[PDB]
Amino acid sequence: MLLITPDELKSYSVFESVKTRPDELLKQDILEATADIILKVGHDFSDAEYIPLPETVRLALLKLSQFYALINGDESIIKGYTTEKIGDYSYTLGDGSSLQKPDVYALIKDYVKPADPDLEGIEAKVRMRSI
């Protein structure tokens, strides 16, 4: 599971909403952000033997997290009065903009489910882990 500090988000995010947001929440939000990335790549970094944190993901999550956290604790942005945090055409800004998710697809596009066969280093680890 994503392991990015909530403070680090505010560190890069110069948003009061993101700043105000408590770490306790920032966590839930951050995780909620990864849920998207994880869905985008259709993979969840669980295996401790495969939990990379490139500038792309970190940035992708930082942006996503910054986006949501931004439309999370703001003035009085509209949102599913009886719904949860999503990524629709909601989050009406004070100006009247449909602030939607950011563009980090290209960021994860680097770590997006590629089109590779089962040629990857398989039957190698096991062969060893077995020994």
Q: Domain of 48: which CATH number?
A: 1.10.3230.10
In angstroms, the CA 72 to CA 77 distance is 8
Mind giving me the DSSP string for 15-28?
-HHHHHS-HHHHHH
Residues 48, 68: Cα–Cα separation, whole Å: 27
Structure tokens at 131: 């020994």
* Residue in the block written with tokens 């990015």: 4
Domain count, the chain: 1
Q: Give the domain extent around 13.
A: 1-131
Cβ density class 16-51: b for 16+ within 10 Å, e for less: ebbeebeeeebbebbebbbebbbebbeeebeeeeee
